[PDB]
Design a protein around this nucleic acid. Sequence first.
DNA 1: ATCAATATCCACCTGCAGATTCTACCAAAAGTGTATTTGGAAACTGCTCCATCAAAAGGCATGTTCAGCGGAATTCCGCTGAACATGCCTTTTGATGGAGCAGTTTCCAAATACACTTTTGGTAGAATCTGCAGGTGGATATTGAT
DNA 2: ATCAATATCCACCTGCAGATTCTACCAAAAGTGTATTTGGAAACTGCTCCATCAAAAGGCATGTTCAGCGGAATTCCGCTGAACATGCCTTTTGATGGAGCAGTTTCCAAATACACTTTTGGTAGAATCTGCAGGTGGATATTGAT
Lengths: 106, 107, 98, 98, 93, 93, 84, 79, 14
Amino acid sequence: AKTRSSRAGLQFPVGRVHRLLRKGNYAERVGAGAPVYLAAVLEYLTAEILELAGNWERDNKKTRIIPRHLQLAVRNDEELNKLLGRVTIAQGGVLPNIQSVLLPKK
Amino acid sequence: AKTRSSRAGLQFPVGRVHRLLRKGNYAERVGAGAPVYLAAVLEYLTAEILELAGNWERDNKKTRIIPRHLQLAVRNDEELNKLLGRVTIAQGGVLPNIQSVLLPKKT
Amino acid sequence: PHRYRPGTVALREIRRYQKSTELLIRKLPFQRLVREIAQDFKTDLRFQSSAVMALQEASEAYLVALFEDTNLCAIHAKRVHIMPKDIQLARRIRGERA
Amino acid sequence: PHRYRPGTVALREIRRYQKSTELLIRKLPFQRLVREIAQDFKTDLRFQSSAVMALQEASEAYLVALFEDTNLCAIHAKRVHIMPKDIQLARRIRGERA
Amino acid sequence: RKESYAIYVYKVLKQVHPDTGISSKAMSIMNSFVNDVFERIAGEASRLAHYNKRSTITSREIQTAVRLLLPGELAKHAVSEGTKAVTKYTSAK
Amino acid sequence: RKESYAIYVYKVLKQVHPDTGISSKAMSIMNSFVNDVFERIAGEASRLAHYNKRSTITSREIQTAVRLLLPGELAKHAVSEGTKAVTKYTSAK
Amino acid sequence: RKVLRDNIQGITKPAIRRLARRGGVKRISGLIYEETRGVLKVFLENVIRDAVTYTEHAKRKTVTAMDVVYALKRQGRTLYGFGG
Amino acid sequence: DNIQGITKPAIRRLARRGGVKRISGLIYEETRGVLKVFLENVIRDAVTYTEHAKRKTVTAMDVVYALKRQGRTLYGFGG
Amino acid sequence: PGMRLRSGRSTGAP
DNA sequence: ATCAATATCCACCTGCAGATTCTACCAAAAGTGTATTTGGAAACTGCTCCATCAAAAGGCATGTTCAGCGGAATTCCGCTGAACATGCCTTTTGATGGAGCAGTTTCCAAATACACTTTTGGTAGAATCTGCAGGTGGATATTGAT
DNA sequence: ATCAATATCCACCTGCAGATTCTACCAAAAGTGTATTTGGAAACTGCTCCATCAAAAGGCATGTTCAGCGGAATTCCGCTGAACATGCCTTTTGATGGAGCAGTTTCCAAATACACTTTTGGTAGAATCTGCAGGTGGATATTGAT
């Protein structure tokens, strides 16, 4: 027995994704290709974020990713930032930023 | 034979609403109370907004309610204004309103 | 030789336009802008008259609601003159910028 | 008598707090305020320690961001002071007020 | 055939203001109005049911939905109208 | 029980940063992230089908839903990956 | 027929003032008009982009009023009056 | 009261995290007011979920949910 | 070989 | 430019809360094989309504002139918030009965699911009805010059 | 404060687009009625984990003091509003041809529906393990007085 995620060449649970669609009352019926396409999209966006969050992890010389990094990754990326523009990452701080009209003098 | 609507004492169609809840895919099943109760809340709200619009119509010496009356009614009522705060009523204009600093003079 | 002080007619206009609900942008012109913008997104497209009307309706209600915010922003700066910076501060706060 | 000129330490703190992530409101006062407010919706209630933390997290992020937009309004009127009216103009444009 | 709430809006219109008409554009707005609130309540109801692992939307879900969605007073009166309607409907047989 | 995308989130992590770990709190955020997007995409998918009087969702919807939900480049890559997972998945046995 | 270009200029200075009028604006800076067209153009691009996405998904060559209405609702600008 | 329990120093720290350099004295009171209106809107909805689930304990999810429909999604306390 | 990230990197491996 | 009071930084250290790896039982999945069912593309095509070109006129855009007054630069000072040091009261940290949130069992009202039978909201279309848009003219402001 | 110049308000008037008024077919609703299935309330209970009490912990409240920021006053340049002359192009009315949306019948690839078998991701009590937060220190960058 081979799993669909294997057939689709994915890390994400194609079966699970599929199970959630039907038990989510999104439609009467669910095509076989939907969960596959979807699982991929979720895996891909997940990779995209760990990727950048990981980078933030090394930037601060740390091997373990924590919320801060995830915040820094998302906000420092114009597209991920827009995607999650109305989401709040608990324990994620804010990007360092001080309005210029407010610093020093000469 | 009695419409479920008359049984509930409603003008709005309980059957149609029960129907749409099904076709809308909101849950596996739908109890018979759901449509009764929803059709009412809907009928209650249209009565509320029509009460106010009709008055706006009257205030404007008009017999027939038009969109503007609907807008005046809604935007002049704290509660409806919020319930529709992100809704745009085509052809409804805006409420006459000018900021003070913009008016002439002093004394 | 009569002549109204600057601002009198402007106030007349606000009272007037705030009383009506007709669209303020020329129809045919707006339609092209739509067909143009649309066309650069996809070719050989067609529009139901009512769809252009909906876009105009949405657009003007949008631009108008935006001007009020702008107007508040100028007044905030102790001006009665809306400027781009006003439109911009508003869109930033609104979350269209930010 | 060393003595930092006005605004030097505030600038120091801004640097500091935009670096860390910890909540800045003391937990217990907050925890009291929450229950107090909820007591008006249902008597004798209990909050998972997590629901409170979520609630505090949402709030601080909300306030923090509201200060950002407030600072923008203050700067808009050529000031460097966030004032009540600044918070007002901001919440207004945001659609929270009018 | 394209359905609408137009006659029901009309009946109600005649109840509150017996001598007032309504233009088609106005009626259309009203038609959008109802479908709008219809959708939102069903949606809230939909999610409420799921959050609570229930497969049925009962009057109860609809009610809580109406409470989460409608502002203060409107909600108090919506609930009333609702509870009342269901009750009468129930004792109808 | 309480399923979560945790393990898969983790497996993907090692694919990108094999030497980077992830705190539990962070894992919890990634799960909220996946559940969120899932919901948004599924929701849009759902609507599209309803708009067009369709009973089945079906990778067409999931795709249009992605185009409607994901920002620029992020969506470009998303659409291919999906179109790829479905092809690879189909060309097998 | 005919190449379409520069129509954002169809959003005349007059039309734009009227709009600020209905919006309560008494005095307008000379730089507003261009800023306004630019803002209007982004709004229209986003709303049309979404409307047309619906159209293509329906396999039609005609953007319907429902397409625009569904598009508007996505962006949080729900419109009443056109079947929506 | 308890709202006054949300001290000046805390509102100052919050403000700081948002880039604020100078803070008018009338701000603190205005802030508490705003924070209260916030908590009322969220809790109200959250508790409404609690009641609907016949419970006496507001859960993190009860909150995550209210927040979501308030349009202020929070990641970290449950999908 | 897995997915292509915007940065150019990919999952590589299964 | 000259100290000097302080803040900030970096390299190094290590204890341990929190992440990790482990063995292990298992309900819940996820895959697989068989039968039944239907959703939706395909082909055909009726007919709605969209793109268009025609024609005319007057509503309204454009471009100019001219000067009123708003914005913005500037000087200025009264005062309010910032920095700081003194004093301790409230919040934080950890231990513990117990109130409930959940896990399991139960069984009955209620929700399918299916069959007809009946009633109704849509609609096509010819048709008479009627609110009021937009024209009118005069009476009552409102406005700006003196 | 009176006065002339215009805009505003308003009740009357009436042709007309848009709304109200049937007539008639009816497919799709919606309702009436046995039959079968079952979701979830109800009662019972164990195990979290939450509210509470208490001692260790360290941040907030108070008052002096004065730097510097905000807002008042002043001033002037030039931009923007009002008014006007010119005439373009949008708007209105229409008729037309055909694209393309939409209705209908057909029908098979694909999905739902179990049935059964294999696996696997989640809980766990247990042992083991490690990234890194504080902490020390000693170097040096920053600020601010002179």
